[PDB]
Amino acid sequence: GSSGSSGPCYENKFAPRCARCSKTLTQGGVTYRDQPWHRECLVCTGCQTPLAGQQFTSRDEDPYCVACFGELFASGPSSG
Ligand SMILES: [Zn+2]
Ligand SMILES: [Zn+2]
């Protein structure tokens, strides 16, 4: 397995791309954490729900919906 004399140079940023897939965002879209995200992609990291323009919070670098935020981290008080 040996190869060389390869590796072109092509790169042009004309529009924002999903921070997850990094494809393209021309039909508007959304932005999570000062970064472009796919309206569809942008979903809770627990229930997998679209927070597109919804009231939620981020934790440990992950978008979590109020339902999860106050369910995972805010688990039962002094519970096993
Ligand atoms: Zn995406
Ligand atoms: Zn959730």
UniProtKB/Swiss-Prot annotation:
Protein localization: Nucleus; Cytoplasm
Residues bearing the modification N6-acetyllysine: 13
Location of the LIM zinc-binding domain: 18-68
Tissues/organs with expression: Expressed only in skeletal muscle.
The protein's role, per its UniProt record: Recruited by SOX15 to FOXK1 promoters where it acts as a transcriptional coactivator of FOXK1.
Subunit details: Interacts with SOX15; the interaction recruits FHL3 to FOXK1 promoters where it acts as a transcriptional coactivator of FOXK1.
Name assigned to this protein: Four and a half LIM domains protein 3
Full-protein residues shown: 152 to 218 of 280
